[model samples]
Target: IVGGYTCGANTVPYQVSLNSGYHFCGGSLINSQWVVSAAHCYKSGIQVRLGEDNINVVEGNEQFISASKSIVHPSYNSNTLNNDIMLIKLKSAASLNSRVASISLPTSCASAGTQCLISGWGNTKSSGTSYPDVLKCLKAPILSDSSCKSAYPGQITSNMFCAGYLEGGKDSCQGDSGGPVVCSGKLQGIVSWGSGCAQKNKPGVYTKVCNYVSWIKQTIASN
Candidate 1:
């Protein structure tokens, strides 16, 4: 809960992967059958690891299920990173208990300047590469809607938010893309973008999870 969070085999953590079999960040198991992530993590043959920090080592578990389909936000703009949200279709369902459970999605979320939590295997510092051996999490306050809009300008709409420590030390960096930002067990956002490292005025950006529930539910239900 300080610098970062770590994951264990008993945890329902997810990973963002690429075609070459490299996993960069971690995600959360939203359901026994669904996983949530950022759209920018997009790569050919993407996959998710549901129970461990080291994705390659985690695949051997019986509870581990690969994704059958990946649904990225249709309007997602890779250039500006607008609408950077996505979901993965698990090959099968997972058992949701203490170790594996979904975070709640709020019907209505906090306004500007709210507090939230971000968890991932992302960089501890801006210049760092590769994810940590153990996943790490950080506590960040949600930026005010006005502040978020001012920094991002037209880029951030009502469907997006910003969360990270303004202390200029802790943050979610490059590898942390597409991870979750939670508040009161309610998933508020998905880590999106930032200008520099953990600057005072700039926290990490995220896709407002509250606004996408219907779309998420519809997709999950139909699929």
Candidate 2:
């Protein structure tokens, strides 16, 4: 995340790095065996790394699991970036620990002015290329639907929401897609898309997690 602070180990235990050979996306562990992420990062044989603090070092608390299943929302639209959420079932349940934990799904929609946090090891540049070895987090606030719609016009769907500074500076960027935007201590949004990283008048957009609780529950229940 750009213009953010480094996170200490175990500070965000529910955070996970989606990897093949290296981190490409971020995710939130919502259950011992289930993860919620972004659909645009879909790829076969993706590995989930839990309890990770720094991507460059082995802190000895990591758990690696293969994605047994990846279910993308049926209504996902790539062109409009709608319904960008995805659920991943781990090959086996992760052993929970102080360094490895799961977050709860949102109980309700987050309204404008709701304070939230965005975390990831994505690019730190608002214009150039830079990456963080350790996770970085930024304090973000949800924007009103009216404001968000005006920012993106008819592209803003009910399945999506916006957060970050309209004046620019901090935001979740590349390699952070599918990461968690925690609000009210719950998973409220997923890093999906935006006009640019930390651009003025272009806030970070996310998949509205509250709108998919039923789908997530049904997906997990079927297992």
Candidate 3:
């Protein structure tokens, strides 16, 4: 996360790290057994670490569990990154506590200018390498569809929305894909992609999560 601050321990309980050998992507614990992330982050044999504030140090509150099943959106396009959402069922239900909990899904879409929180253990530098071991976050306003489309030209789709400063600074970057973007305490977005970290007129694009609430519940119940 660029232009962000370190998240205090247990503050962001729903946040989890996709430990595929290392922290590759971030996810949100939507229920005891299911985690939501970006489809592009799909990987087998991943360990989901809940209640994690830092990845490098041994945080006592962290619960490391394996992914029993993973379901990626059928319409997910790797090239354009549309419908880039995924769900991972934990091998066992997480024991909820102050350090581990679920976040509610949004019933409706976030309106334009709504300030949302984007959290992750992704790169911090806008130009090169500098990933934070501790989770970091930033507040960015939701941009209108018109503005988002104008910024990306023929790329922005209904399945995606953008959040960041138009002047450039503060953005979710590499290694943050699939991370949560919480709006009004609801899971609303998933970090998908961006042109460059904190670049002018190129805000961080995310998977519009409100659009997948039904798909999430159906996939969970039917699976």
Candidate 4:
């Protein structure tokens, strides 16, 4: 959340916090019982907190649900960070309401220079140790695949896209993995990884959600 600010409690109703004893990653509720996240964020004993803003306290609207199943892409590559997306199935369907809702998946690829918003409860500064209790959000413009290739070289793949500030100010940081990157009210990307928080020429890299729609729908249907 470098160069970002606090967002409203219900600004992004689909946003959920993935907790493994503590806040570790962010996710987006795609349906009443399904959540989408980054494959790298998967871990044992993970729980999901929905309709929540503050992580340290449980509000009346909050729903703490256990993860029933996790489906990581079979082709996920941790070394190169390719195909870094996953889906979590809740043990029971969530109770959707005004403060708790689901986001829509993208119908097409994100265009170059398109603006999107990323929200999470990650570190506020690149060098800071403290992570925020409330969700933070920042506006980032999508960089062309060519521009991203210049920064990441051989690491940039077709399954990934880039978004952030080139001047090294606004971007997602550690603990923000799996968070939703929304564009025009659709989920365009998932916070996958980055070189560092807001580093020069190192825009935050994300899993392109559009490219995995077939996989996502298939996984949801069979699982």
Tens-digit lDDT string for candidate 3 (98-142): 789999999999999999999999999988899888889898899
Residue 167's lDDT within candidate 4 is 84
Q: How would you encode candidate 4's per-residue C-alpha lDDT over 1-223 as one tens digit per residue?
A: 8899889887889999998898999999999999999999989888999998888987677999999999999999988889999999999999999999999988888799899999999888876667888889999999989989999888988999999977898899998999999999999999999987988899999999999999999999999
Q: After superposition, how far is residue 170 of candidate 3 from its true place, in Å?
A: 0.9
**With candidate 3 superimposed using the best TM-score fit, by how many Å does residue 14's alpha carbon deviate from the native?**
0.4
TM-score of 3: 0.98
Best by lDDT: 3
List candidate 3 segments past 4 Å from native.
none
Per-residue lDDT of model 1, residues 85-150, tens digit only: 888887778765555567776788777667676776666666555556556767778877777777
Give lDDT per model, in order.
0.69, 0.92, 0.93, 0.92
Error of 1 at 77 (Å): 1.9
In candidate 1, position 85 carries an lDDT of 83
Candidate 1, residue 175: how far the Cα is off, in Å? 1.2
